[PDB]
PDB file of C-alpha atoms in Angstrom:
ATOM      1  CA  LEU A   1      70.479  88.798 114.875  1.00 18.53           C
ATOM      2  CA  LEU A   2      73.277  86.185 114.684  1.00 19.77           C
ATOM      3  CA  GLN A   3      76.921  85.821 115.769  1.00 19.91           C
ATOM      4  CA  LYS A   4      79.726  84.023 113.886  1.00 19.25           C
ATOM      5  CA  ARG A   5      83.484  83.650 114.447  1.00 18.97           C
ATOM      6  CA  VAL A   6      85.351  85.240 111.556  1.00 23.50           C
ATOM      7  CA  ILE A   7      88.550  86.976 110.608  1.00 23.07           C
ATOM      8  CA  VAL A   8      88.727  90.546 109.328  1.00 23.17           C
ATOM      9  CA  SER A   9      89.336  89.756 105.644  1.00 25.04           C
ATOM     10  CA  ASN A  10      90.005  93.230 104.339  1.00 26.19           C
ATOM     11  CA  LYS A  11      89.076  96.901 104.443  1.00 27.17           C
ATOM     12  CA  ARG A  12      88.498  99.321 101.605  1.00 27.36           C
ATOM     13  CA  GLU A  13      88.136 103.084 101.641  1.00 30.66           C
ATOM     14  CA  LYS A  14      86.545 104.472  98.499  1.00 29.59           C
ATOM     15  CA  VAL A  15      85.527 107.911  97.271  1.00 33.34           C
ATOM     16  CA  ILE A  16      82.175 108.530  95.564  1.00 28.40           C
ATOM     17  CA  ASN A  17      79.783 111.344  94.560  1.00 25.87           C
ATOM     18  CA  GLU A  18      81.930 111.271  99.339  1.00 27.05           C
ATOM     19  CA  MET A  19      83.712 108.657 101.449  1.00 29.08           C
ATOM     20  CA  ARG A  20      82.492 105.064 101.552  1.00 31.05           C
ATOM     21  CA  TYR A  21      83.808 102.424 103.925  1.00 30.92           C
ATOM     22  CA  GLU A  22      83.636  98.633 103.650  1.00 29.58           C
ATOM     23  CA  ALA A  23      84.957  95.756 105.751  1.00 26.86           C
ATOM     24  CA  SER A  24      84.994  92.111 104.763  1.00 24.41           C
ATOM     25  CA  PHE A  25      84.671  89.254 107.214  1.00 25.34           C
ATOM     26  CA  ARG A  26      85.630  85.677 106.455  1.00 29.07           C
ATOM     27  CA  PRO A  27      84.957  82.410 108.295  1.00 31.37           C
ATOM     28  CA  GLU A  28      87.971  80.885 110.068  1.00 32.02           C
ATOM     29  CA  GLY A  29      86.283  80.602 102.827  1.00 32.40           C
ATOM     30  CA  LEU A  30      83.750  83.164 101.638  1.00 35.04           C
ATOM     31  CA  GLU A  31      83.926  86.903 102.338  1.00 36.35           C
ATOM     32  CA  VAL A  32      80.933  88.989 103.379  1.00 36.55           C
ATOM     33  CA  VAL A  33      80.938  92.737 102.773  1.00 35.95           C
ATOM     34  CA  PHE A  34      79.497  95.166 105.305  1.00 39.23           C
ATOM     35  CA  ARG A  35      79.141  98.935 104.886  1.00 36.93           C
ATOM     36  CA  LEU A  36      80.384 100.948 107.861  1.00 39.67           C
ATOM     37  CA  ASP A  37      80.837 104.575 108.820  1.00 35.53           C
ATOM     38  CA  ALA A  38      84.369 105.826 109.462  1.00 35.09           C
ATOM     39  CA  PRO A  39      84.506 105.535 113.274  1.00 37.47           C
ATOM     40  CA  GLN A  40      83.273 101.948 113.133  1.00 38.89           C
ATOM     41  CA  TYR A  41      85.670 101.307 110.248  1.00 39.35           C
ATOM     42  CA  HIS A  42      88.796 102.725 111.892  1.00 42.33           C
ATOM     43  CA  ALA A  43      87.902 100.596 114.926  1.00 44.07           C
ATOM     44  CA  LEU A  44      88.542  97.368 112.985  1.00 45.32           C
ATOM     45  CA  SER A  45      91.910  95.787 112.269  1.00 44.36           C
ATOM     46  CA  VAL A  46      92.465  93.737 109.139  1.00 47.34           C
ATOM     47  CA  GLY A  47      93.685  90.389 110.381  1.00 48.36           C
ATOM     48  CA  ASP A  48      91.894  90.208 113.715  1.00 50.81           C
ATOM     49  CA  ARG A  49      89.641  87.228 114.308  1.00 52.27           C
ATOM     50  CA  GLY A  50      86.684  87.323 116.621  1.00 55.09           C
ATOM     51  CA  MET A  51      82.925  87.493 116.969  1.00 56.03           C
ATOM     52  CA  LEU A  52      80.865  89.252 114.299  1.00 57.60           C
ATOM     53  CA  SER A  53      77.334  90.295 115.264  1.00 56.86           C
ATOM     54  CA  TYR A  54      75.011  90.937 112.353  1.00 56.04           C
ATOM     55  CA  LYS A  55      71.436  91.147 111.119  1.00 54.81           C
ATOM     56  CA  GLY A  56      71.321  90.417 107.393  1.00 54.23           C
ATOM     57  CA  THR A  57      73.687  92.778 105.600  1.00 58.22           C
ATOM     58  CA  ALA A  58      73.681  95.122 108.609  1.00 54.02           C
ATOM     59  CA  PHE A  59      76.866  95.129 110.658  1.00 50.49           C
ATOM     60  CA  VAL A  60      75.964  95.159 114.336  1.00 47.96           C
ATOM     61  CA  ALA A  61      79.412  94.648 115.848  1.00 45.71           C
ATOM     62  CA  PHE A  62      82.739  92.867 115.798  1.00 45.48           C
ATOM     63  CA  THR A  63      84.431  91.900 119.050  1.00 43.52           C
ATOM     64  CA  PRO A  64      88.025  90.747 118.465  1.00 45.53           C
ATOM     65  CA  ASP A  65      89.205  87.837 120.607  1.00 42.67           C
ATOM     66  CA  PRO A  66      90.316  89.092 124.051  1.00 45.16           C
TER      67      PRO A  66
END
């Protein structure tokens, strides 16, 4: 259950067998990929930097800088 300041590296929407969402966070080098559902995914903005809350590979939250 940690927190780390990162930037929203990138976001990928992918179709499988249906929709898979992934967001990458990078330290203000080294991306970390988190799986998200759509609502959580559309809430993020590639480029924003802020606080990422996480437990292992489980995304808990990302609060962009005020």
